[PDB]
Write a protein that binds this ligand. Structure first.
Ligand SMILES: Nc1ncnc2c1ncn2[C@@H]1O[C@H](COP(=O)(O)OP(=O)(O)NP(=O)(O)O)[C@@H](O)[C@H]1O
Ligand SMILES: Nc1ncnc2c1ncn2[C@@H]1O[C@H](COP(=O)(O)OP(=O)(O)NP(=O)(O)O)[C@@H](O)[C@H]1O
Ligand SMILES: Nc1c(C(=O)N[C@@H](CC(=O)O)C(=O)O)ncn1[C@@H]1O[C@H](COP(=O)(O)O)[C@@H](O)[C@H]1O
Ligand SMILES: Nc1c(C(=O)N[C@@H](CC(=O)O)C(=O)O)ncn1[C@@H]1O[C@H](COP(=O)(O)O)[C@@H](O)[C@H]1O
Ligand SMILES: [Mg+2]
Ligand SMILES: [Mg+2]
Ligand SMILES: [Mg+2]
Ligand SMILES: [Mg+2]
Lengths: 419, 419
């Protein structure tokens, strides 16, 4: 590992150039904890390893969901490799629950006020003035430029939407551990190579407020250190145990709590191309997808036996029925399983207007749903599993963001061809 | 006129009970101008008449548009009758252009920054603390109750949307006088009889910032008095002339700058019911609407002569063609006039799926549009005239608000039937 010059150093991290890696840097954590802009600073042994472990797990989680993130890989106990960014000097905060500075700036609001949707705020980075709140209008008027990207209305709107999405993903991911994510702070930078705005810096135990069972008095985050009247050695051991508590649970956010499976049943091997599109699209949400050939019309006995194989092994299953012309496979399956059935018929413009009604108009006592897009039927199957699986949910959530970002970028492009 | 007790008195107005009018009060203006929470106060002769005249014109304008407003009628030179309200102690501000307190609270924003859409802000009324900015969260948490109405999320969302709509109407109404409405402040109350939230207090020359030709140095509003280093008698005569300038122009906001007409051409007197619905709906936007009987099929010579009558008298006209079955009246009219033509065919479920295509699929060189709803065709005709007529525009704008308010009220009702 070919380490170059120390680029900068701050309160908790040293950033080094990597001579064998163009556009990449090494972020080495220090055994330092800090708070405020006064003398609250301490050595804390093992903090560097805890910060590194949390950020490395959280960045891998957000990256596997599809959030664009400045993270390459973990590099031992106390560092990580990242794409080099020109950091935007704004703290982006997201709140589910009103506490901390929100109450000070909004006297009359009580602790516990819930934000639907989560509240996003901006703070300009400046220790001299204790990080003052900025409006979107102030950030636009600053006309900041980083690695050649002017930070305008489009870029601010993107960081704002991304902050909400990142919060919701981390919020949903902590829920299975019976922890309430109250709020968080993140920072973005411009990747010096790609010129993309990406989540950067770290997300660690100083970034958020984490309340087991929603109970503030059980707070496990750095607020436990900020709240101390006086820092004693007995006080720092409590803080360290809180950081250890989070370090011991954070890797479980990468694990699937519940199993998911899509079974695509096709009446004919001529509709294989259409079923390959469903299977591929399921792969994008990390949901295993099996293809099976069975006809309701010509082998209804075999359809029910295949159904029984998937009903009988304890794995939650969504069936997707692909039947051309008069669809009996969706209906028959729908009538004989408690699991959901989606008809995704391979309609063409020739007879599709006529064929679709055999999926849509069903006798009473049948729940069978219809989705015409094959990518759509995978997404709907994912949305169903997202109710139980935070990993699938997070891919859906990040995909809503990324698609929205794509529209903003295409509008920005075509707007330049308006002069 | 049976005047009762003086209910309250402030810096500029005395409010009196009316013994012959239940739930109504008389707001008598005083010849006083004021600014800030210090000694800036002055007698100004004729100010009471100028304030009364402006508020009376502005309230009549907003009321004729369809904005719910605490105004009954003008009552001589210096008073007006209003429904009595329990006033909500919030100043609602709307901004098109960043100036004044927006720049102080957002250092870095330059004078002239434009808000798309117009920015709404709240200020809590308290002279002791110079009227501090409140968040929507602070107003909700105050749990204010006025004439029995709890001010909750629904009520705050309504005042916020109403503030934007009122600003946009006044903004559009000043445009024909080549005046830029920069920003404004309004207050709402609860009508003690109806229990509706309504625009109340006044809107006068102290309520807004008015720049002729967009030029701040020509400001005609009360900012001209606020800006004086020292108040001299020569200084007050300039302020008075600015107030007179606005008083002399404000009545022109009630006058139509451009004439509007809808001509509904029907192929058959059996479609008269359908044409009566278009005419009634046109009446709601204040647009005269004539009915005429002509067939393209059986009297095309007469169709063209009737067309010529309306093309030839210099009144801007939208033609609405009502033809059952094979619509030739829309197309023929569309091909022979430069004025817009709307086909509004009287479709029923029997043959409407078949008949509609004769309105929709036209030879090249025909602009003829289709609107199936008869109320819809009137609204579309209004939207066309709204590009030229601020009065029509304002009815459309207020109708978007009122419809949105209706949805919030129906959601609030059905939500109570969710327990
Ligand atoms: N991917 C990245 N590329 C380049 N610089 C980065 C990246 N991630 C973080 N940094 C910077 O690394 C520096 C050192 O981090 P740290 O020691 O935590 O600083 P700090 O004292 O918190 N300074 P600051 O964040 O500016 O208030 C920070 O100033 C970050 O801007
Ligand atoms: N329709 C109304 N019904 C009842 N009271 C009203 C109505 N419109 C205005 N008022 C009240 O009339 C009072 C007298 O007005 P004014 O003299 O302008 O007061 P002020 O000194 O500006 N006081 P304030 O608005 O409370 O800061 C105000 O306090 C308003 O709340
Ligand atoms: N961690 C930080 C910081 C921040 O600068 N923190 C450090 C400074 C440093 O990391 O070196 C500190 O002084 O404690 N700013 C916001 N937040 C987080 O943001 C949400 C809201 O915080 P609030 O604005 O209520 O204080 C909560 O989750 C904080 O942890
Ligand atoms: N007129 C007032 C008031 C207000 O309280 N005015 C008076 C008090 C009084 O009327 O007795 C004064 O002190 O001048 N607050 C906001 N505005 C209007 O609101 C927009 C924004 O004003 P900003 O917040 O920039 O000062 C601009 O159009 C003001 O005229
Ligand atoms: Mg901060
Ligand atoms: Mg930092
Ligand atoms: Mg004020
Ligand atoms: Mg007043």
């Amino acid at each position: 590992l070919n380490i170059g010059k120390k680029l900068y150093e701050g309160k908790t991290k040293e950033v080094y150039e990597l001579l064998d890696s163009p556009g990449k840097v090494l972020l080495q954590s220090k055994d330092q904890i800090t708070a405020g802009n006064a003398a609250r600073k301490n050595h804390l042994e093992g903090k560097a390893a805890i910060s590194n472990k949390i950020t490395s797990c959280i960045f891998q989680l957000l990256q596997e969901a599809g959030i664009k993130t400045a993270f390459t890989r973990k590099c031992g106990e106390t560092a990580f490799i990242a794409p080099q960014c020109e950091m935007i000097p704004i703290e982006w905060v997201c709140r589910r629950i009103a506490t901390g500075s929100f109450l000070k700036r909004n006297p009359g609001v009580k602790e516990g006020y819930k934000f639907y949707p989560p509240k996003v705020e901006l703070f300009f980075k400046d220790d001299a003035n204790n990080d003052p709140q900025w409006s979107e209008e102030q950030l636009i008027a600053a006309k900041f430029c980083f690695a050649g990207l002017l930070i305008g209305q489009t870029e601010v709107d993107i960081m704002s939407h991304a902050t909400q999405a990142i919060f919701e993903i981390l919020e949903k991911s902590w829920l299975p551990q019976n922890c309430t994510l109250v709020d968080m702070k993140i920072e973005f930078g411009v990747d010096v190579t790609t010129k993309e705005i990406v989540l950067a810096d770290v997300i660690d135990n100083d970034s958020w407020r984490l309340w087991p069972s929603g109970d503030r008095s059980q707070q496990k985050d750095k607020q436990s250190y900020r709240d101390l009247k006086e820092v004693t050695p007995e006080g720092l051991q409590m803080v360290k145990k809180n950081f250890e508590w989070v370090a011991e649970r954070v890797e479980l956010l990468l694990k699937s709590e519940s199993q998911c499976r899509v079974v695509v049943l096709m009446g004919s091997t001529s509709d294989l191309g259409h079923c390959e599109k469903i299977k591929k699209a399921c792969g994008n949400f990390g949901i295993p997808c099996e293809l099976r050939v069975t006809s309701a019309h010509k082998g209804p006995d075999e359809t029910l036996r295949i159904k029984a194989e998937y009903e009988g092994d304890g794995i939650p299953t969504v069936f997707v029925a692909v039947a051309g012309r008069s669809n009996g496979l969706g209906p028959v399956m729908s009538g004989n399983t408690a699991y959901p059935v989606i008809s995704c018929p391979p309609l063409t413009p020739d007879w599709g207007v006529q064929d679709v009604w055999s999926s849509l108009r069903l006798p009473s006592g049948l729940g069978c749903s219809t989705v015409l897009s094959p990518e759509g039927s995978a997404q709907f199957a994912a949305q169903i599993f997202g109710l139980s699986n935070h990993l699938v949910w997070s891919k859906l959530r990040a995909s809503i963001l990324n698609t929205w970002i794509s529209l903003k970028q295409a509008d920005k492009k075509i707007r330049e061809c308006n002069l």
